[PDB]
From Swiss-Prot:
Interacts with SERPINA1. Pfam families: Trypsin (PF00089). The keyword Calcium applies. This is Serine protease 1. It is an enzyme of class 3 (hydrolase). The gene is PRSS1. Keywords: Calcium, Digestion, Disulfide bond, Hydrolase, Metal-binding, Protease, Secreted, Serine protease, Signal, Zymogen. PANTHER family: RIKEN CDNA 2210010C04 GENE, TRYPSIN-RELATED. Substrate binds at residues 171-172, 174-175, 177. The active site is at 40 (charge relay system), 84 (charge relay system), 177 (charge relay system). It comes from Bos taurus (Bovine). Its EC number is 3.4.21.4. The lineage of its organism: Eukaryota, Metazoa, Chordata, Craniata, Vertebrata. Its main location: secreted. It is found in: Secreted, Extracellular space.
Length: 223
């Protein structure tokens, strides 16, 4: 997260860190047994870490649970990033309380102009590299699909939205991948891609989660 702020310990209780010997991606807890992240976060050997603030210190509210199964969306396209979404099942159910909590799925999509909360342990610099230990947060508005298409020279589908600041300076970044965009208490997005971070006319792009609720619900119901 570039140009954001320290969230505060456990203030984003659905935020997870995916760990393979080190933090590599974020995710969102959607019930006691399932996390949603980005398909581009797929790898084997995933441990889900819940209840994290400082990812380098055991502070006492963590739950570390191995993944039993990962399911990348059947139509994920790694060249265009279309359908950048993956479900991860936990080997055991997480214990839910104030510091570890699921985030509601949307019943309708979010509108352009709404300020949403984006969070992660990604790079905090637009030019350099600096990775934080504690969770960072950013409020950013959803931009119109037309604005997003005007800015970018890459493929943008109806399964993506963009959010952020066309002037630059505030954005998600590498290491925030897979993490949440929450708007009015609903998980509306997954950190998916961007041309650099916080650069002028290169906003963040996000998987448009509202398009996937049926797939999420049926996949969970049958697995
Ligand atoms: C859509 C498409 N097919 N394409 C072609 C390939 C391009 O891939 C690039 C281009 C560039 C570039 O410099 O232009 C960079 C720079 C970086 C690092 C060093 C920061 N990465 C890795 C990265 C990883 C995750 C991110 C997650 C989120 C956001 C964000 N801004 N919200 C940025 C992210 C950036 C990049 C990935 C993207 C456009
Ligand atoms: Ca910790």
């Amino acid at each position: 997260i570039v140009g954001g702020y320290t969230c505060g310990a456990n203030t984003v209780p659905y935020q997870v860190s995916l760990n393979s010997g080190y933090h590599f991606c974020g995710g969102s807890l959607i019930n006691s047994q399932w996390v949603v992240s980005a398909a581009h976060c797929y790898k084997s050997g995933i441990q889900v870490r819940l209840g994290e603030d400082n990812i380098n210190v055991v502070e006492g509210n963590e739950q570390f649970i191995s993944a039993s199964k990962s399911i990348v969306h059947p139509s994920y396209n790694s060249e265009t990033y279309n359908n950048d979404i993956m479900l991860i099942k936990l080997k055991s159910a997480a214990s839910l309380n104030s510091r570890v909590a699921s985030i509601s799925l949307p019943t309708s999509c979010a509108s352009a102009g709404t300020q949403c909360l984006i969070s992660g342990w990604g790079n905090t610099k637009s030019s350099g590299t600096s990775y934080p230990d504690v969770l960072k947060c950013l409020k950013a508005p959803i931009l119109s699909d037309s604005s997003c298409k005007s800015a970018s020279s890459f493929i943008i589908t109806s399964n993506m939205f963009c959010a952020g600041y066309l002037e630059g300076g505030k954005d998600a970044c590498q290491g925030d991948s897979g993490g949440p965009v929450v708007c009015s208490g609903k998980l509306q997005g997954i950190v998916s891609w961007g041309s650099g971070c916080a650069q002028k006319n290169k906003p963040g792009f996000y998987t448009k989660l509202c398009n996937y609720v049926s797939w999420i619900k049926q996949t969970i119901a049958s697995n």
